[PDB]
Amino acid sequence: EVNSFSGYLKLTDNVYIKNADIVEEAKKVKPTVVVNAANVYLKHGGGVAGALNKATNNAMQVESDDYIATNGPLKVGGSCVLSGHNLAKHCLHVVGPNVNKGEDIQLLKSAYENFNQHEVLLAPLLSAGIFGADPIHSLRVCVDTVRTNVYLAVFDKNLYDKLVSSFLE
Numbered sequence: 192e193v194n195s196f197s198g199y200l201k202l203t204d205n206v207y208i209k210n211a212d213i214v215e216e217a218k219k220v221k222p223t224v225v226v227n228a229a230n231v232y233l234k235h236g237g238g239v240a241g242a243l244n245k246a247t248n249n250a251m252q253v254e255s256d257d258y259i260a261t262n263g264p265l266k267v268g269g270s271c272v273l274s275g276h277n278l279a280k281h282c283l284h285v286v287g288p289n290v291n292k293g294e295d296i297q298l299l300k301s302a303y304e305n306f307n308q309h310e311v312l313l314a315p316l317l318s319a320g321i322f323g324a325d326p327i328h329s330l331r332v333c334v335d336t337v338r339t340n341v342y343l344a345v346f347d348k349n350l351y352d353k354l355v356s357s358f359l360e
């Protein structure tokens with residue numbers, strides 16, 4: 192029953208991908224860890240973070256505000272482990288670089304390295320969408336950097352097909 196991932200395409204021995212909303216996956220799978228595509232003040236105002244927070248009925252945001260009060264903001268490329276609420280045992284909040292805001296694309300390697308502290312994770316494609324990184328480059332960084340078992344959920348069939356085609360060429 193735990194980590195019941197289904198319908199994924201295996202890309203490498205440790206990286207799997209699916210066309211799916213990460214919130215819907217977290218409900219079906221009940222993963223040990225769900226990754227959030229966070230910002231440094233853990234303000235979950237939209238996109239992936241806003242969807243995961245809404246699915247917890249704002250409990251994630253209240254917990255996040257209390258973590259920031261005590262520990263201060265994260266650094267770009269860094270992470271913290273908080274509760275997964277009804278979505279997972281734990282949420283790994285990871286800050287990838289926001290290239291549209293001038294942050295260094297090289298920090299995407301540091302961001303994916305946080306996944307290596309967890310044996311199995313359900314995650315989004317870091318720094319893609321409105322963070323502005325090239326999503327084919329984000330997938331290449333994930334495959335080359337993550338060594339633990341990562342199940343990527345990408346909520347867009349057009350991007351999913353472009354990512355699989357580019358990996359398999």
Ligand SMILES: CC(C)[C@H](Nc1ncnc2[nH]ccc12)c1ccc2c(n1)S(=O)(=O)CCC2
Nearest residue numbers: 212213228238239242316319320321346347
């Ligand atoms: C590329 C896009 C399809 C993808 N969205 C998603 N991928 C998987 N489950 C999802 N549920 C709701 C949206 C959503 C995606 C991945 C990463 C990032 C963003 N968006 S962003 O624009 O929210 C900025 C943070 C980085």
